[PDB]
Amino acid sequence: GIPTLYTPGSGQFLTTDDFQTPCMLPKFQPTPVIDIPGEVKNFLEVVQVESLVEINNVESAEGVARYRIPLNVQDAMDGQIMALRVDPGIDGPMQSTLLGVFTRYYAQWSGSLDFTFMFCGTFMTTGKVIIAYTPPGGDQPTNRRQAMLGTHVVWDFGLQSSITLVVPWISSGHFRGTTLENTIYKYRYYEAGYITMWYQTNMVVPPNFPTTASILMFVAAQPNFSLRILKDRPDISQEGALQ
Amino acid sequence: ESLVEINNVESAEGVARYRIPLNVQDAMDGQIMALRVDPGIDGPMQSTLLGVFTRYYAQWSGSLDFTFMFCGTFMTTGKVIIAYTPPGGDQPTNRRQAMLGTHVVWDFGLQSSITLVVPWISSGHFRGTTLENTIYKYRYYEAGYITMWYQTNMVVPPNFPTTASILMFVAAQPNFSLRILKDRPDISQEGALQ
Amino acid sequence: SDRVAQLTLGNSTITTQEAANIVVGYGRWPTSLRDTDATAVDKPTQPGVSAERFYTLPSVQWTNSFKGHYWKLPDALSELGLFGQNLQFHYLYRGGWVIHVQCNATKFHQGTLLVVATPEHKIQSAESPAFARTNPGEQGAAYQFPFTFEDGTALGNALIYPHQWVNLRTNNSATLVLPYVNALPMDSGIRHNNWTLSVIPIVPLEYAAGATTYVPITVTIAPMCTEYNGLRAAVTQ
Amino acid sequence: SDRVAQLTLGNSTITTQEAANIVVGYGRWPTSLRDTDATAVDKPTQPGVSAERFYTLPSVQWTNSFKGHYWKLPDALSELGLFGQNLQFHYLYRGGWVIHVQCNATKFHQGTLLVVATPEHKIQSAESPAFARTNPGEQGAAYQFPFTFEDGTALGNALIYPHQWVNLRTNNSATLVLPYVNALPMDSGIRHNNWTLSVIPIVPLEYAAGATTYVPITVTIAPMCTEYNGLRAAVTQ
Amino acid sequence: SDRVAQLTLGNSTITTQEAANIVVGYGRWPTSLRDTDATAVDKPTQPGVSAERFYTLPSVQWTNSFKGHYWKLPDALSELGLFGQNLQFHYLYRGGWVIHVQCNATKFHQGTLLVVATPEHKIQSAESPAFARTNPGEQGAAYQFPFTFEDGTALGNALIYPHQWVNLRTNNSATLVLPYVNALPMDSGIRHNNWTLSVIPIVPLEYAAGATTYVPITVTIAPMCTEYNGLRAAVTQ
Amino acid sequence: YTNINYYENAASNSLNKQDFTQDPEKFTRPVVDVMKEAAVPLK
Amino acid sequence: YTNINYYENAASNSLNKQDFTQDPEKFTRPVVDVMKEAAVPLK
Amino acid sequence: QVIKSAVRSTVENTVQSTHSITTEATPALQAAETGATSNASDESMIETRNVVNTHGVAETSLEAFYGRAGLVAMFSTDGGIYRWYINFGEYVQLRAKLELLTYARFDMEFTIVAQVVNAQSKVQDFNVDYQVMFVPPGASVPENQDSYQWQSSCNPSVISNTGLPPARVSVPFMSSANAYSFSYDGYTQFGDASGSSYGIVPSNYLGMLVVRTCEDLDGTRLRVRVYAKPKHVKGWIPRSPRMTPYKSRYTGVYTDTTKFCANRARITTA
Amino acid sequence: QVIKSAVRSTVENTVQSTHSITTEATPALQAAETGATSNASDESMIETRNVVNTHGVAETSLEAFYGRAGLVAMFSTDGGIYRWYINFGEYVQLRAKLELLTYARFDMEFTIVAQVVNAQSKVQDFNVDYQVMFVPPGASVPENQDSYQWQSSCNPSVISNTGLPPARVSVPFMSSANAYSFSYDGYTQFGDASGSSYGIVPSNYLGMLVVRTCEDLDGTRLRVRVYAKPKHVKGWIPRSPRMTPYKSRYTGVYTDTTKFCANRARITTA
Numbered sequence A: 001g002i003p004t005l006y007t008p009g010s011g012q013f014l015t016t017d018d019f020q021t022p023c024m025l026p027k028f029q030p031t032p033v034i035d036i037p038g039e040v041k042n043f044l045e046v047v048q049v050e051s052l053v054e055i056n057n058v059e060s061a062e063g064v065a066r067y068r069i070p071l072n073v074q075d076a077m078d079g080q081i082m083a084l085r086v087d088p089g090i091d092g093p094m095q096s097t098l099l100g101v102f103t104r105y106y107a108q109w110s111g112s113l114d115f116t117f118m119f120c121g122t123f124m125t126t127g128k129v130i131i132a133y134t135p136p137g138g139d140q141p142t143n144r145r146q147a148m149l150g151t152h153v154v155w156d157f158g159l160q161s162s163i164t165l166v167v168p169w170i171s172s173g174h175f176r177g178t179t180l181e182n183t184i185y186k187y188r189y190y191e192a193g194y195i196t197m198w199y200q201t202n203m204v205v206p207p208n209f210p211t212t213a214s215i216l217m218f219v220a221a222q223p224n225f226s227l228r229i230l231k232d233r234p235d236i237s238q239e240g241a242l243q
Numbered sequence B: 001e002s003l004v005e006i007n008n009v010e011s012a013e014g015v016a017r018y019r020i021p022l023n024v025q026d027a028m029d030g031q032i033m034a035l036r037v038d039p040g041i042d043g044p045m046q047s048t049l050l051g052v053f054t055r056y057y058a059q060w061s062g063s064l065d066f067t068f069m070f071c072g073t074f075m076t077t078g079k080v081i082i083a084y085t086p087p088g089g090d091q092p093t094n095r096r097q098a099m100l101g102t103h104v105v106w107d108f109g110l111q112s113s114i115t116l117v118v119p120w121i122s123s124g125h126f127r128g129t130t131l132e133n134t135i136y137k138y139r140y141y142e143a144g145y146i147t148m149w150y151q152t153n154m155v156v157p158p159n160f161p162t163t164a165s166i167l168m169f170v171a172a173q174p175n176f177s178l179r180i181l182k183d184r185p186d187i188s189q190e191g192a193l194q
Numbered sequence C, D, E: 001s002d003r004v005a006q007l008t009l010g011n012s013t014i015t016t017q018e019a020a021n022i023v024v025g026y027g028r029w030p031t032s033l034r035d036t037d038a039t040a041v042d043k044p045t046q047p048g049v050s051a052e053r054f055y056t057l058p059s060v061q062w063t064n065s066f067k068g069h070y071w072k073l074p075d076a077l078s079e080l081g082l083f084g085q086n087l088q089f090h091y092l093y094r095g096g097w098v099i100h101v102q103c104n105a106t107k108f109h110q111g112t113l114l115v116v117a118t119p120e121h122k123i124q125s126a127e128s129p130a131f132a133r134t135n136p137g138e139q140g141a142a143y144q145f146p147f148t149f150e151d152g153t154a155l156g157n158a159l160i161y162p163h164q165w166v167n168l169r170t171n172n173s174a175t176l177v178l179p180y181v182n183a184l185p186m187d188s189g190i191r192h193n194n195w196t197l198s199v200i201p202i203v204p205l206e207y208a209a210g211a212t213t214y215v216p217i218t219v220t221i222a223p224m225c226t227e228y229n230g231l232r233a234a235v236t237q
Numbered sequence F, G: 001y002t003n004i005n006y007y008e009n010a011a012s013n014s015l016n017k018q019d020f021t022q023d024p025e026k027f028t029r030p031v032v033d034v035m036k037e038a039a040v041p042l043k
Numbered sequence H, I: 001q002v003i004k005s006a007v008r009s010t011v012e013n014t015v016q017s018t019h020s021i022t023t024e025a026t027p028a029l030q031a032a033e034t035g036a037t038s039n040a041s042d043e044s045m046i047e048t049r050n051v052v053n054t055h056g057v058a059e060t061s062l063e064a065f066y067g068r069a070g071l072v073a074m075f076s077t078d079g080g081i082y083r084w085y086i087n088f089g090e091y092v093q094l095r096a097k098l099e100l101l102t103y104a105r106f107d108m109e110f111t112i113v114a115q116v117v118n119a120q121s122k123v124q125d126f127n128v129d130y131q132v133m134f135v136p137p138g139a140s141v142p143e144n145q146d147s148y149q150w151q152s153s154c155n156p157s158v159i160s161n162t163g164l165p166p167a168r169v170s171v172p173f174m175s176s177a178n179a180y181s182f183s184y185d186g187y188t189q190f191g192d193a194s195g196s197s198y199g200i201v202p203s204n205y206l207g208m209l210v211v212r213t214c215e216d217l218d219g220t221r222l223r224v225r226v227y228a229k230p231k232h233v234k235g236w237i238p239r240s241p242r243m244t245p246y247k248s249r250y251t252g253v254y255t256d257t258t259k260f261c262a263n264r265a266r267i268t269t270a
């Protein structure tokens, strides 16, 4: 017998362990690996795909309508269109997106985000809107003047239906927490900032045209985005074994 | 090749269950026999070599060899069509429907036998050996049917037997293989043997 | 001239242990339409094994009053398997055939059948032929005037066309391979029948008293080297 | 990313003067079954131009209450032309697709359609789905729960599947080329639908008062690079 | 696979004009004991032509109630010629066999016999088998349970053992060459029977009315490549 | 470091240690016509 | 991979890892006269 | 095919950019209608600095996401035996993870934890021997604690004790298919147009586990938990993730809803 | 001898064939009377495609079929001792497997599982020391728990505890023969024409196992299960498999039957 000394840890079942174990069917030979389109190797490939943001989360909005940002001919200037926190892993408009479902499977995130907007008004409907990203420090900007002092993009409606607003990674630390749960961990420390939209000029229409039109909101991770520390997705639960 | 207990009917006992019956017709295009080709399910094939071993495993794959030997008198002639119908519906209802599948037309003569290869035609690389449906929904795997019909007729000279017998052989082809060993369901006991 | 054979086309294999060689009409096997003969400019469809296999038709009984029976091609298979589907869906069709006629009796019987394939065999023994005789379907039709071949010629001279005999003492089958024949590169498979296959008894079925008297004749045909042009919706004559 | 296109398959040619590029699912065009993936040992049938062409299905009206409409593949063409014939006659089928969704309005209208092709899109919003919804035929079926995609997922995340949008101000059509996808080398075309094609309105149809209000949505599909195995008689689910 | 044969061993020559090839069990002809397998140290006796020739046993009638008949080896010849003498006088015996089963009828008869040689075929259908059934002598014994092969197995699977068939329409004889099989280099010829030769009817004897009904089955066996050790006085079981 | 197999079948092996990602283009940009970043998409 | 013996007698060794099959001819075709597939068996 | 997939081990760096006043380069202009995701990059939308980014991508690989044990079954014996059908729809966590891929191939590590409990479900410090037998479809299933089937001469069995470390075995990729399917728009058999046979991949069912106590317990029972861990993961065609609750163990049936996230007062208030 | 046996690790491929209209090649024609199995191949009966088949043949090898533990004995002590005769006819599963070969040579792995049970056969959590002694023929067999024979100075013994993992030892190929026989058409001794001495290979009996508890249990007893696993299998002459039930532990005696599979109404209905 070779002298051994077993140590603490022995017998334990760590769900993340990685040992080699005897196979139940030692000589079994699996079917061949055939050619199937669409193979994925890392889930980062999936969060880089744009998916729709449930931005219109208000009482009056039900179903498909919660994906539509509303625009309409103004009779006043510099007005606000929408506002939202850019944090990808907290409850709200972004939790049902691809970026969100996966950010919620992890505890920390890092990277620039891709916010793409597509206009859906008639071909004759024009307009200019300013979209801004306000870095941490205070509250969402109160007027267009305060918003344009941050990172922004002025969007002109035309043949190219969409525009991208990159919310670049600007953080004190290399990573942020995916939740801003405050009462315990004081994680509001990590808030990433706000994204607001305002009328640059106005939405102008010809006679008798619809005076309201819709903007769809897309979101994805940039190529420098990554997640760390897997954890159970909070939205999937049950009260007992399924029948 | 081992013999298939194809004549599994009340009237058939013992050795007689291995005999397919032929007889001089007075009608045309008639049916002689029918069976599921699945080698591991209960029925005519479970007591064969192919079957006993298919029943020791949970999955199978390969072409099957179905060889038939005629045993009528030297003067008894005939032509029969044997067909393999791939999955989709039920066994064919008439010769016309059967011949639209894989078949062989057999002519009686000095060469007493004929082979019908039921080629491996499956969606998946393997099939389950049982078609137990109530739980696993394994009827998903049914491999098809094999039917035999008169191509012409069995003709005999005066005073000869008007019925003769066909023996049915079955074996696996060279591309057949089994996976996942399991206990043969036919071997059991109620307690330690005395 | 061996007496055995195996014919394998597609997913169908046929065998006989008492054949009498194999005939190839005019010494020509089926061939595809050449670029210098073709006129229809569209890329053709070529079904392959789906339509080029053996189709067995319902059997006919060699009765005492039997005069013969005929099938028109491609009419007889105009509704079978994917071959028939392709025939209906296309304006144009071209193709050859492999024919296998079967009839076994015993060494105690005697009889002789002429198995002939005639190019453009007109059924003109009536002033206004009935569609049921010119195009009898898969069941084919019975001969009413076998001596004059249903076309005003001598049955005895029908041997100028591709044929074999089924002489019960010698063979239980006849096998013929036919090429496409027409004064056109292609034609419609529903409006024109290029070949007719007839089985006519020239020496009556006889046998030793008590022998089996129920003797069928089965015909099995296979399209071969076929091609279709002018696709549209399905249409029959 | 040009805005015009012409798609020619077989005897059918399609054109659009307001497209928005062309999507190829998973970056893979349709390919035939390789010898190392294949398991069914019989020589396959390859219909060619007879089944690989464009089939136009009956149009759907973009009404005010419109939630969307879906077609299952190959179910929707399971009874059209020679493609459907081949699907029924064979146990096994394999194939890709070329999809062209059409919907023109005017520069006085506004609306947006999501045109998505989903692999294995289950219609599971009912405990025991009705065959008329899982396999709706050439007429397809209407959406009842577009927000949850009829399968318990978020409509907004359906963009993880191959898709295009028909945004009336930008384009009047969507074009998709889909490869065969399955955990099998081949499968039955009657018992399993590999892809589902849905057209769901995400921004309602609106227009300047008095503009045409009758706006149809036409879907045109083409099988591509198809092959079939296990020939027998015709069978449907 | 010729249909004629002549078998010449010693002073005996056998012929048949309707055979069906010749089977060699397990592909191995009879061979002598090698020096590395042997354990008995005494020089063996090798009778040669005196014991290695054809011995014909009394015939059995293929009656209407006939189930089959079996002979055990070397028991059946344990008392014939010098082969039997040598078997009795030696403690140890080793040897192979050449078996020729005969049964001619006419072209007006039909019937089929399975001719099988089984290694270690136990007659265990009784709790305490009778010596007259386990060792029936030159007359052999009749089958009582042919379907279960007298050993609790399926008759149909007996083809896993060396065999031939005597199908009256095809052949009038079966020929088998068997090698010595045992888990020992040699054994006692009186206490252990290595092979059993059974002739079981699977298709009953039938014929045209009036044909000869008295049909015998004759079995002719020849020891081959035999050797004996442990000489003493004669002893039987 | 040590990665050596003790058991017969590969199913007994420990987790794969090749954890990388690949270009998401087949998912993010499955289009036929190239649309460079510097250009306008629709032309 | 590792296959090294610890014990003295070969009966202690693990299962053989040479799981192949061989031609079944000695069982499926133990005849003296060759009968090619393309030929007729009885001539 | 047309689109190639390069491989990398770190996220992309950021390189320094400068201002731009031009009419030739408009990276911010996109067209979502094409089906493509925007390709406007950081460097093109703002003036950036150089950042050598070494953040890795390992924990989001299929193997790092799936490679850990998760509960798939929990039960107690009734008469010293229990038969469980191997299917992962009982517990939702691991189920919701697997359904993120359409097709996938993987080996598995099964860990079995057992302990004895009395009638009031209070754990007992009792070491008893237990047997776990895998019975493939078509094999005779044990009717009770001492039926002949537990001889297990062909069926794989594992015998351990509630006082020994948990039992564990590896399992190969066993389907007849070339990958397991987690979404199936089809039927289980031909000639069945019934909703009860829709959406089930029969080849995903490989049998059942039958558990027993080698000898009878007097008044107590075996409490068992089966954990399963995917290994060597290969997957194809990512799917839209589950956004509504599971109701049935065997199907994806669900209850429609009108919103996913909770509402807020105004769209202009963050 | 005349017929050679080539070796292979995968089943045969399928190569593309074409049509055939000829009188020289008739592969479909066979003659079962010869004793040969048909040799008509796939490629000759239909038009096939190319299929590179890589399906393996490993799990059907003798070693993969036989190489796993199976129950061969089960018993309880009576007075703290029990004598079992080493023979595998008590339990039918492993027995029916071995009888698929006529002769075979193999080593064996014996695993012994023991536990204490009370008079009502309810398992006890009691760790007691037990001894298993192999007594070859001709050696003095222990009469009871404390006889002198348990000194075991020559006979092999294994001593373990019901609280320790199961005991296990390997055993060599021990017969006096050159292979074990699973069918024997002969008698056990010369000068015996009695049915009670027919069909038993005495060299297949190598003794007995005598089990005891090193010290007496008060009111309880040792419950033992012996598993056996063949290793390094070599076999000759495959046999027709068992198709009827076993009745006796020591012989193949059986009850005749008129059918094997259940009947159906018509031979023409599948």
Ligand SMILES: CCCCCCCCCCCCC/C=C\[C@H](O)[C@H](N)CO
Binding pocket: A024, H086, H087, H088, H089, H095, H108, H110, H132, H133, H134, H156, H157, H158, H169, H171, H174, H180, H204, H205, H206, H209
């Ligand atoms: C002896 C120890 C027990 C070993 C148990 C081995 C069982 C074989 C594992 C099969 C794993 C396949 C699971 C695949 C898919 C899931 O069931 C799906 N949720 C069903 O739709």
Ligand SMILES: CCCCCCCCCCCCC/C=C\[C@H](O)[C@H](N)CO
Binding pocket: I086, I087, I088, I089, I095, I108, I110, I132, I133, I134, I156, I157, I158, I169, I171, I174, I180, I204, I205, I206, I209
């Ligand atoms: C000390 C641990 C116990 C080790 C026991 C060693 C016993 C020797 C093993 C002999 C195995 C031979 C079995 C061979 C044949 C079977 O008994 C047959 N069924 C009897 O006909």
Ligand SMILES: N[C@@H](CCC(=O)O)C(=O)O
Binding pocket: B189, B190, B191, B192, H145, H146, H147, H148, H149, H150, H151, I071, I074, I091, I225
């Ligand atoms: N098969 C055994 C019981 C199995 C066990 O309890 O381990 C018998 O019937 O006696």
Ligand SMILES: N[C@@H](CCC(=O)O)C(=O)O
Binding pocket: I145, I146, I147, I148, I149, I150, I151
């Ligand atoms: N041989 C010892 C008893 C053996 C034992 O109990 O271990 C004696 O006679 O005292």
Ligand SMILES: [K+]
Binding pocket: H010, H011, H012, H013, H052, H053, H054
């Ligand atoms: K980097």
Ligand SMILES: [K+]
Binding pocket: F036, F037, F038, F039, F040, F041, H026, H027, H028, H029, H030
């Ligand atoms: K751009």
Ligand SMILES: [K+]
Binding pocket: A114, A220, A221, A222, H037, H038, H039, H040
């Ligand atoms: K991006």
Ligand SMILES: [K+]
Binding pocket: I010, I011, I012, I013, I052, I053, I054
């Ligand atoms: K191979």
Ligand SMILES: [K+]
Binding pocket: G036, G037, G038, G039, G040, G041, I026, I027, I028, I029, I030
């Ligand atoms: K042959």
Ligand SMILES: [K+]
Binding pocket: B065, B171, B172, B173, I037, I038, I039, I040
């Ligand atoms: K074969």
